């Protein structure tokens, strides 16, 4: 029962124009089995478009590749990104966490979310007038991949609450 292919892909931006299917594959195979690996090229000139994609056999392999950033491929530092649910990636480092009610504290959010990435800010939202907890929070990470992993999960359970988590701008 394989994970959906969409969740096993990495977009690789910023390629050297001299990177090929073969050199991209040789590089990224260090972190897992690649079922697909392609450099996007112009249909007439064959000149590289400067980006490509690799598809791993498993999500854990995608994680391994992302944890090995920065990647220098054929002499240039590239920009890998995983897919999240217009074809444009909203690359952000902050999430909204809703449904946490009044009993959820910072350590609850930290203990859970720290396994997705390095946390820089936790903001538990309180009422401007009364100071009472409003039942939602924002978490800011040091890097976008944490957020990307978070928002593709179907479920998040924090402090016994089923939470709604979205990218925050
Ligand atoms: C995760 N991700 C982000 C980047 N991405 C792109 N695709 C095609 C062209 C340019 C792009 F930035 C789509 C995708 O798979």
UniProtKB/Swiss-Prot annotation:
Sumoylated. The modification Phosphoserine is found at residue 16. It comes from the Eukaryota. Residues 8-85, 93-169 form the RRM domain. There is a cross-link at residue 101 (Glycyl lysine isopeptide (Lys-Gly) (interchain with G-Cter in SUMO)). The keyword Amino-acid biosynthesis does not apply. There is a cross-link at residues 2, 72, 167 (Glycyl lysine isopeptide (Lys-Gly) (interchain with G-Cter in SUMO2)). Residues 86-169 are annotated as: Globular B domain. Its main location: nucleus. It is found in: Nucleus; Cytoplasm. GO terms for biological process: alternative mRNA splicing, via spliceosome; cellular response to glucose starvation; cellular response to sodium arsenite; import into nucleus; mRNA splicing, via spliceosome; mRNA transport; negative regulation of telomere maintenance via telomerase; nuclear export. GO terms for molecular function: DNA binding; G-rich strand telomeric DNA binding; identical protein binding; miRNA binding; pre-mRNA binding; protein domain specific binding; RNA binding; single-stranded DNA binding. One of its GO terms (cellular component) is synapse. It is linked to Inclusion body myopathy with early-onset Paget disease with or without frontotemporal dementia 3: An autosomal dominant disease characterized by disabling muscle weakness clinically resembling to limb girdle muscular dystrophy, osteolytic bone lesions consistent with Paget disease, and premature frontotemporal dementia. Clinical features show incomplete penetrance. Amyotrophic lateral sclerosis 20: A neurodegenerative disorder affecting upper motor neurons in the brain and lower motor neurons in the brain stem and spinal cord, resulting in fatal paralysis. Sensory abnormalities are absent. The pathologic hallmarks of the disease include pallor of the corticospinal tract due to loss of motor neurons, presence of ubiquitin-positive inclusions within surviving motor neurons, and deposition of pathologic aggregates. The etiology of amyotrophic lateral sclerosis is likely to be multifactorial, involving both genetic and environmental factors. This is Heterogeneous nuclear ribonucleoprotein A1. It comes from Homo sapiens (Human). The lineage of its organism: Eukaryota, Metazoa, Chordata, Craniata, Vertebrata. The gene is HNRNPA1. The chain holds residues 7 to 181 of 372 of the full protein.
């Amino acid at each position: 029962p394989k994970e959906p292919e969409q969740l096993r892909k990495l977009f690789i931006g910023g390629l050297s124009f001299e990177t090929t299917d073969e050199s991209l594959r040789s590089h990224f195979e260090q972190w897992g089995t690649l079922t697909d690996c392609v450099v996007m090229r112009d249909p007439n000139t064959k000149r590289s478009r400067g980006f490509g994609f690799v598809t791993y056999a498993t999500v854990e392999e995608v994680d391994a590749a992302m944890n090995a950033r920065p990647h220098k491929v054929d002499g240039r530092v590239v920009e890998p990104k995983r897919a999240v649910s217009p074809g444009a990636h909203l690359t952000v480092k902050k999430i909204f966490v809703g449904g946490i009610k009044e009993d959820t504290e910072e350590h609850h959010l930290r203990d859970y979310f720290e396994q997705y990435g390095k946390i820089e800010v936790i903001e538990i939202m309180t009422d401007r007038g009364s100071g009472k907890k409003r039942g939602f929070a924002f978490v800011t990470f040091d890097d976008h991949d944490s957020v990307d992993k978070i928002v593709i999960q179907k479920y998040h359970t924090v402090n016994g609450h089923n939470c709604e988590v979205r990218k925050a701008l």
